[PDB]
Design a protein around this ligand. Structure first.
Ligand SMILES: [Mg+2]
Ligand SMILES: [Mg+2]
Ligand SMILES: [Mg+2]
Ligand SMILES: [Zn+2]
Lengths: 190, 161, 204, 196, 134, 52
RNA sequence: GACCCCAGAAAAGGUGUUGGUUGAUAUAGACAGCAGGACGGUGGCCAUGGAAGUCGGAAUCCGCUAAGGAGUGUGUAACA
């Protein structure tokens, strides 16, 4: 079955403005700007409000699989709005039984050095995605903070660290050491 | 300090449970660091200390001497805190201003040892010289030329046999 | 020691019954065809479920026995020991032969190896009768028994009452009108012809 | 059985509303069946309590509006986990006895703590084998008289946080009164009135 | 704390037991009875439902008294060696008798059902002595 | 000697999962079908066994 | 994947998608999520070294109820 019309609307806050260039969305807010094109999805995007700033995604004559993309686009745009207004902050706790995992943060927070993971002498060097800043928290002991605007990049960097600290040739239900994402929140808490 | 406290608590609960004898033919059996029946250190590097020894050296900084050392032996362990800025002990964790305070154990027992360890492991020659001259210990031959972990082991042997 | 059943899946030969011409036939694996409460009255188990083959093929007596055992075990587990009656309605009357390997295909006629039941499209293989509230258990037991058979089978909830040949919606008022008289697990049809003495035995 | 259950409920609620002209609408906190039955024992001799689906109640009273008017005031008020207590006694007596019969419920893990509770420094009197639960919380303790003695006060639970699994069982074995809560009267209804 | 807190339940009953009981295992909780105390307590609690006898003990610092909670299965199996309505009617008077009740009819229904270890048609068309206990 | 909170945090990623009985794939704990083509997306799954 | 003979496939699976059959719930509020309660007789009886709702054999009830099985599963030696 081909549904005649499937549309979804997202609301844009006052402090953030959205510009459309075809299927390329530019979301500019107080924390910076974000670009993302959706040329891989055949939808129409329209800006409706001069007062309340609604963005509408319409898909005409779509089947099941391509009606599944309307809310995907809407959620991506909402994540863009969230990133440019509040930002994204992923906390990572480093857990270990015996050997403390020593994480040092190199230039501007874009490079992470894991030293003593499970007592190994190999030094893990993980480079964050551009626009992502890593730091060692002051409130908690074994905690890293990854902050950025693009949720894609922030969570990809968190996954890079988590998969860098991976146990080999051992029962992973017993050897639980590693750095794991503990919380996925925002910055500015608003 | 927390690990030490957990260990002494476990030993004391073993003594309480299986040693059903209260203060009787043997009296009080429970180990207490304040009582001097608990020691700390490492056998491999041949250095160990006790609250007796640290109270002794701090009193020497400050019979009757034995009694005073015994009193500060009670003072050095527990949740009783010490103000680093004032130089006086205290009971409440909050300072008069409100900032958190280190306990007496961590501030004047673990802290000098930690400073010695940091200086020798990081090869800060000026700071190691300052620490050894403040702790007024001498070194014999063949170890003043050794640096690093051998230096640390020799210094700890000389300071806290 | 037994050949794969794919070698005797199809009704290729004419029916070859155990007879005075076919002697020395080993006994079929299945010797029991009714299980559960066989003594239950007709009114106790009004729900009937059938396994019906969609294939014109041969089912070995070993497979009939295996399916019987599996369905019986599931029915005992779900409905209790006395909560159902099962009837296997295929008897292995066809004898399959084997030419065990003078030399070659000389004198190739085989010796009786085993027995199979010859089943047609739309024929009932197994039946379970039980209370109305055990329909799901009957369907699942027959569905499990389907895995012991080569071809394709359908599970069908019969429209008849129990194991009889009378429809389940007219059974009760036929019993009321005395057109049906219970006798064990079945019913006897009483036509309105014959001596009047038989009619006088009823209505009295 | 659902249809007859709902019809029996409608009959019950309309007859109870007609038979009792004075009732208090009360919001139920995280109150257990034990606390509910305790209230039932303490109140059932003189008053009754009925609570169910808000849509059930609203449908019943909206259908009963034309027969017995002046009940429309309750419709935009029965929201959330609320119910009615039907009493023929005075407002002050019902209110103060209902606030009097509070129950000290235990501190369940994974629960918001509204009240702040701090354990004092005292000989808890339990055996010298439950030291594991104290060490899990990090409490320094010693043995005196063959029992665990708290050397100093420690703040267990703050306000508006999560009660940890170990803290819950430590409180349970220490046998004190943690944060407690009952059913709080949202408001009253005295023959067509709304008060506090 | 009333000079003692020994409200723990003891779940031995029937024969004296003494050595065979778990009373030696649970006695050092209160430290008072020991082998003299559990013997005198079980001598005083041998009867009153000679089944498992989940009971409570209260210690007077040397001598223990025993109160037997009125478990319905306990008392029913004790009084069994049939309608028997009157015996269970009079058995529930000294009870705590909460049973989440509205009337004593609720108590008698609850125990007339707990005795189903059939007394269920009685529960159905019960009409005699509905308010007889109070 | 990992504290229980961090232990649960690590077990969320290492232990609390489902396993396809046909291809052993490590699926999220709420999975009803395997995500992998080579087993045919089977619904035959089991819990990942604990170290208890 | 792609044309009689014909030149390769089965049982069994799929929360891929597409049709169809039958049934059920729901504005007296479905479904899914997040959030509260999940009781009392009663640690029901017999099994017993311990089996308390959860190794088992039968029973499968009652009251308060908005509702709760004398129990769906994890878990404990048994409880929790
Ligand atoms: Mg979302
Ligand atoms: Mg290995
Ligand atoms: Mg032939
Ligand atoms: Zn798989």
């Amino acid at each position: 079955m081909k549904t005649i019309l499937s549309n979804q609307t997202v609301d844009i806050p006052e402090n953030v403005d959205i510009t459309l260039k075809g299927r390329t969305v530019i979301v500019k807010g107080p924390r910076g700007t974000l670009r993302r094109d959706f040329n891989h999805i055949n939808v129409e995007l329209s800006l409706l409000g001069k007062k309340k700033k609604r963005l509408r995604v319409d898909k005409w004559w779509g089947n099941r699989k391509e009606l599944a993309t309307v809310r995907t686009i809407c959620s991506h745009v909402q994540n863009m709005i969230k990133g440019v207004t509040l930002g994204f902050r992923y906390k990572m706790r480093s857990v270990y039984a015996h050997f403390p995992i020593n994480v040092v943060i190199q230039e501007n927070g874009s490079l992470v050095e894991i030293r003593n993971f499970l007592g190994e002498k190999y030094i893990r060097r993980v480079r964050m995605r551009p626009g992502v800043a890593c730091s060692v928290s002051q409130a908690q002991k074994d905690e890293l903070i990854l902050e950025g605007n693009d949720i894609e990049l922030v969570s990809n960097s968190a996954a890079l660290i988590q998969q860098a600290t991976t146990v080999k040739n051992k029962d992973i239900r017993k050897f639980l050491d590693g750095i794991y994402v503990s919380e996925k929140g925002t910055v500015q808490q608003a | 300090y927390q690990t030490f406290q957990r260990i002494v608590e476990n030993v004391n609960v073993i003594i309480s449970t299986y040693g059903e004898g209260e203060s009787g033919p043997m009296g009080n059996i429970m180990i207490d660091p304040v009582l001097g029946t608990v020691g700390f250190g490492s056998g491999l590097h041949g250095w160990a200390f006790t609250l007796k020894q640290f109270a002794e050296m701090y009193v020497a900084k400050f019979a009757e001497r034995a009694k005073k050392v015994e009193d500060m032996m009670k003072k050095l362990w527990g949740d009783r805190y010490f103000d680093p800025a004032n130089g006086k002990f205290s009971k409440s964790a909050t300072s008069p201003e409100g900032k958190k305070l280190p306990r007496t154990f961590c501030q004047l027992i673990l802290d000098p040892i930690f400073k010695v360890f940091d200086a020798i492991m990081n090869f800060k020659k000026e700071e190691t010289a300052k620490l050894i001259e403040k702790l007024d210990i001498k070194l014999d031959s063949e170890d003043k030329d050794k640096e690093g972990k051998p230096l640390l082991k020799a210094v700890m042997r000389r300071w806290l046999p | 020691g037994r050949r794969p059943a794919r070698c005797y899946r199809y009704c290729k030969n004419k029916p070859y019954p155990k007879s005075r011409f076919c002697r020395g036939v080993p006994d079929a694996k299945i010797r029991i065809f009714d299980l559960g409460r066989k003594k239950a009255k007709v009114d106790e188990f009004p729900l009937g479920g059938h396994m019906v083959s969609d294939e014109y093929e041969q089912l070995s007596s070993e497979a009939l026995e295996a399916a019987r055992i599996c369905a019986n075990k599931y029915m005992v587990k779900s409905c209790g020991r006395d909560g159902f009656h099962m009837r296997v309605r295929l008897h292995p009357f066809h004898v399959i032969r084997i030419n065990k390997m003078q030399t070659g295909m000389r004198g190739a006629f085989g010796k009786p190896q085993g027995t199979v039941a010859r089943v047609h499209i739309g024929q009932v293989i197994m039946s379970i009768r039980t209370k109305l509230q055990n329909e799901e258990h009957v369907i699942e037991a027959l569905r499990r028994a389907k895995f012991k058979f080569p071809g394709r089978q359908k599970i069908h909830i019969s429209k008849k009452w129990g194991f009889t040949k009378f429809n389940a919606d007219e059974f009760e008022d036929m019993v009321a009108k005395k057109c049906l008289i219970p006798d064990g697990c079945g019913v006897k049809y009483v036509p309105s012809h014959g001596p009047l003495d038989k009619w006088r035995v009823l209505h009295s | 059985d659902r249809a007859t259950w709902k019809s029996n409920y409608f009959l019950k609620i309309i007859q109870l509303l007609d038979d009792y002209p004075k009732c208090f609408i009360v919001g139920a906190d995280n109150v257990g069946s034990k606390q509910m039955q305790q209230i039932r024992m303490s109140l059932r001799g003189k008053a009754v309590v009925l609570m169910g689906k808000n849509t059930m109640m609203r449908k019943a009273i909206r259908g009963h509006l034309e027969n017995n008017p002046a009940l429309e005031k309750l419709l935009p008020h029965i929201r959330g986990n609320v119910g009615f207590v039907f009493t023929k006694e005075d407002l002050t007596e019902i209110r103060d006895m209902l606030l009097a019969n509070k129950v000290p419920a235990a501190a369940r893990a994974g629960a918001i703590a509204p009240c702040e509770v701090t354990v004092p420094a005292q000989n808890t009197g339990l055996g010298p084998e439950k030291t594991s639960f104290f060490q899990a919380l990090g409490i320094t303790t010693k043995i005196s008289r063959g029992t665990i003695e708290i050397l100093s006060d420690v703040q267990l639970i703050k306000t508006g946080d999560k009660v940890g699994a170990s803290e819950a069982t430590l409180l349970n074995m220490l046998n004190i009164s943690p944060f407690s809560f009952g059913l709080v009267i949202q408001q009253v209804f005295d023959n067509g009135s709304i008060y506090n | 704390p009333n000079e003692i807190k020994v409200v723990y339940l003891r779940c031995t009953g029937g024969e004296v037991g003494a050595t065979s009981a778990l009373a030696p295992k649970i006695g050092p909780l209160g430290l008072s009875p020991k082998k003299v105390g559990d013997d005198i307590a079980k001598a005083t609690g041998d009867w009153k439902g000679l089944r498992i006898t989940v009971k409570l003990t209260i210690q007077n610092r040397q001598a223990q008294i025993e109160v037997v909670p009125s478990a319905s299965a306990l008392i029913i199996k004790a009084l069994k060696e049939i309608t028997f309505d009157e015996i269970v009617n009079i058995a529930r008077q000294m009870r705590h008798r909460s049973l989440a009740r509205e009337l004593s009819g609720t108590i008698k229904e609850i125990l007339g059902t707990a005795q189903s270890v059939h007394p269920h048609d009685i529960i159905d068309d019960i009409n005699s002595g509905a308010v007889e206990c109070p | 000697i990992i504290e229980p909170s961090l232990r649960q945090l690590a077990q969320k990623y290492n232990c609390d999962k489902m396993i396809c009985r046909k291809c052993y794939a490590r699926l999220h704990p709420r999975a009803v079908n395997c995500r992998k083509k080579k087993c045919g997306h089977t619904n035959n799954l089991r819990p990942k066994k604990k170290v208890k």
